[PDB]
Amino acid sequence: IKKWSVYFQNPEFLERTRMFLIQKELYPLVRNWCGVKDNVRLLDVGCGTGYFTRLLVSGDEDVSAVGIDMEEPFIEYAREKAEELGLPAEFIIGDALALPFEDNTFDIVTSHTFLTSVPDPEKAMSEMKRVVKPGGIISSVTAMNFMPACNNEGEYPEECTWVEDLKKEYMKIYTKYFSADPLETRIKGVKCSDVPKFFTGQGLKDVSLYPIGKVFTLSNAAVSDEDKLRYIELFYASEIKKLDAFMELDIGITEEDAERFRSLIGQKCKWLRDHLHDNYAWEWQGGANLLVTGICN
Amino acid sequence: IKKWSVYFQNPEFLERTRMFLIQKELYPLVRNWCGVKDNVRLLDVGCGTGYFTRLLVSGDEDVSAVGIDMEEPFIEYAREKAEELGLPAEFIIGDALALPFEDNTFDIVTSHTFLTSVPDPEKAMSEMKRVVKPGGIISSVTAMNFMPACNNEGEYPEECTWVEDLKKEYMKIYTKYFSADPLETRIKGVKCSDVPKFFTGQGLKDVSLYPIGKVFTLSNAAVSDEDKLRYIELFYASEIKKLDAFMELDIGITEEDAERFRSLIGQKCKWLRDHLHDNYAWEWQGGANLLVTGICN
Ligand SMILES: Nc1ncnc2c1ncn2[C@@H]1O[C@H](CSCC[C@H](N)C(=O)O)[C@@H](O)[C@H]1O
Numbered sequence: 001i002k003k004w005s006v007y008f009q010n011p012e013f014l015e016r017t018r019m020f021l022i023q024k025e026l027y028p029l030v031r032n033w034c035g036v037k038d039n040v041r042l043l044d045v046g047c048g049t050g051y052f053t054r055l056l057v058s059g060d061e062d063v064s065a066v067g068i069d070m071e072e073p074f075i076e077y078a079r080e081k082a083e084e085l086g087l088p089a090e091f092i093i094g095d096a097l098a099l100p101f102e103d104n105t106f107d108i109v110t111s112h113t114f115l116t117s118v119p120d121p122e123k124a125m126s127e128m129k130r131v132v133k134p135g136g137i138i139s140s141v142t143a144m145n146f147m148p149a150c151n152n153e154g155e156y157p158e159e160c161t162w163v164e165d166l167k168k169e170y171m172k173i174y175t176k177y178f179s180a181d182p183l184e185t186r187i188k189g190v191k192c193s194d195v196p197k198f199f200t201g202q203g204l205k206d207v208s209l210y211p212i213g214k215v216f217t218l219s220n221a222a223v224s225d226e227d228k229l230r231y232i233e234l235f236y237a238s239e240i241k242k243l244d245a246f247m248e249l250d251i252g253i254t255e256e257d258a259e260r261f262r263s264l265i266g267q268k269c270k271w272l273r274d275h276l277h278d279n280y281a282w283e284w285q286g287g288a289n290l291l292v293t294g295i296c297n
Numbered sequence: 298i299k300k301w302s303v304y305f306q307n308p309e310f311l312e313r314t315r316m317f318l319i320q321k322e323l324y325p326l327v328r329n330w331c332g333v334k335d336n337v338r339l340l341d342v343g344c345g346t347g348y349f350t351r352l353l354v355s356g357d358e359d360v361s362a363v364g365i366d367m368e369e370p371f372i373e374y375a376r377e378k379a380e381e382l383g384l385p386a387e388f389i390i391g392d393a394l395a396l397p398f399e400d401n402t403f404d405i406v407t408s409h410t411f412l413t414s415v416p417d418p419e420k421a422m423s424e425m426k427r428v429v430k431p432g433g434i435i436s437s438v439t440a441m442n443f444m445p446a447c448n449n450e451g452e453y454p455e456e457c458t459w460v461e462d463l464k465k466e467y468m469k470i471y472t473k474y475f476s477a478d479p480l481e482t483r484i485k486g487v488k489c490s491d492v493p494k495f496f497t498g499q500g501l502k503d504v505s506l507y508p509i510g511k512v513f514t515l516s517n518a519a520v521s522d523e524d525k526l527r528y529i530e531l532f533y534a535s536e537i538k539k540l541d542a543f544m545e546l547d548i549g550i551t552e553e554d555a556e557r558f559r560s561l562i563g564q565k566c567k568w569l570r571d572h573l574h575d576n577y578a579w580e581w582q583g584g585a586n587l588l589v590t591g592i593c594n
């Protein structure tokens with residue numbers, strides 16, 4: 001099995017794919033539903049690059065957070081991110097199955113797209129229950145489906161010659177990635193449909209569900225330029241680093257192929273940058289994540 | 298083609314299936330995104346029983362609304378509903394393709410799960426553009442998928458003998474309904490994935506997308522008893538009225554079958570009522586709807 005933070009999802013990939021999951025305007029609601037509130041200290045388990053960690057501590061409330069993850073690269077990045085934004089969040093390398101804390105340390109315990117992944121969700125939940133204070137809220141956000149509920153590849157202007165080639169190269173190189181790094185190891189946890197049942201089954205009380213819609217497109221007028229430009233940077237960087245990591249291994253990608261793929265990714269990004277205000281391609285994707293909370297005794 | 302409000306979706310069916318689409322807590326956000334604001338008068342096109350109409354005028358803002366629909370039963374019900382709740386909404390029988398109003402009557406024009414349905418969405422949109430004031434917001438909410446993104450039939454206690462029989466009878470009677478009333482006539486409009494493209498394609502500007510998550514389950518601790526009890530009533534009534542309408546036609550349902558189906562539906566409802574506080578079946582379903590707005594010139 002290949003190192004998660006290098007070959008499967010690099011730090012930039014996590015940042016680019018999480019950025020648009022939850023509208024800015026939903027943050028106070030999501031904070032409230034997870035039990036964020038004055039003088040709350042929270043733990044975010046498998047925090048990756050700290051996306052959800054940041055979201056929860058980004059309000060006006062007097063809160064602090066610890067994020068824990070197995071991947072050194074994720075923790076490094078999370079620290080850099082939090083430090084940059086001045087946020088009260090600590091990031092720590094460690095194991096979900098073996099939390100380096102005493103019982104009843106945290107008011108709130110959460111995880112984001114994590115219970116889906118762990119080989120042993122019962123034990124992880126057992127840890128979350130141990131470390132939360134009596135009567136505190138444990139929350140999980142998980143994908144409702146691995147497929148998007150709706151999807152359009154978009155229609156780019158006819159001038160754009162990179163569109164067909166890149167589509168072709170992308171699912172050629174990516175099928176090669178799926179060989180060398182199979183997905184089935186990463187999705188050993190609680191099935192999407194089973195999470196609510198899992199919560200009451202682990203003894204949690206007042207089990208509550210809240211859907212959280214998600215949408216992606218650079219054509220969206222309600223998304224800031226800054227966010228679009230930040231996404232484009234992260235997309236470029238995430239694709240190039242993933243490719244390079246696989247080259248430095250061999251998996252069946254010629255150097256000509258790689259330079260082609262680089263060139264095309266570069267052309268897409270250049271087009272997206274140049275058409276920041278008038279991108280009407282509607283390459284778009286949506287669906288919903290599911291928030292589940294329960295109280296521990 | 299069978300009368301929509303009788304054979305396809307009766308007023309109670311619309312109320313039961315819309316009730317849980319949008320969390321109460323999202324109402325101010327959804328109002329804002331559609332351009333609801335003081336001294337706004339709005340039109341809701343194909344308003345059905347007036348679900349979305351009610352949602353938009355239910356805030357503190359000084360707003361009023363007209364709902365328009367082809368179905369007399371929907372309009373009747375909408376009136377009864379609005380009158381009961383004291384809401385500033387008028388409901389009118391009429392045609393989306395032929396709006397009984399002058400140009401520039403409304404500040405805002407909206408529709409909910411409608412652009413998906415109309416045989417001629419271009420003309421409907423043309424009407425919406427005509428009737429909205431210059432620079433006003435046209436909005437549409439549509440399903441992201443006809444399937445739910447996630448799903449669990451649930452695990453009812455072993456004592457419940459109605460569970461297996463009803464599953465069996467439901468998709469037996471319903472396959473008979475799909476024969477006598479085929480679905481394909483009702484879904485002649487804009488494909489889910491095409492709505493954003495449709496908006497810019499119809500000349501609308503600053504086209505904006507907002508996902509709206511949805512979830513259903515009577516096991517949810519965050520849903521009020523009152524809402525659960527109201528859902529159960531509507532479910533009972535919607536199923537019985539649909540069945541009766543089809544009996545009064547012949548479609549291949551014996552009277553024994555009907556009385557069986559009645560009995561079972563009744564037993565499910567009795568169980569749901571009796572287990573209002575301790576339903577841990579997790580019969581649940583979720584996904585997201587998509588809100589699209591654009592400005593008219
Ligand atoms: N046993 C374990 N202990 C700690 N972290 C783990 C773990 N197993 C998996 N992880 C981490 O779980 C994460 C799943 S996905 C990334 C999750 C992050 N919350 C986000 O949405 O951005 C990965 O970061 C992975 O490194």
Ligand SMILES: Nc1ncnc2c1ncn2[C@@H]1O[C@H](CSCC[C@H](N)C(=O)O)[C@@H](O)[C@H]1O
Nearest residue numbers: 343344345348366367368391392393409410
């Ligand atoms: N040409 C037309 N003019 C007016 N209403 C129409 C129409 N074609 C379809 N409708 C109505 O469009 C609706 C679609 S579904 C019900 C929509 C309602 N907004 C809700 O979500 O509860 C039906 O009520 C149907 O009667």
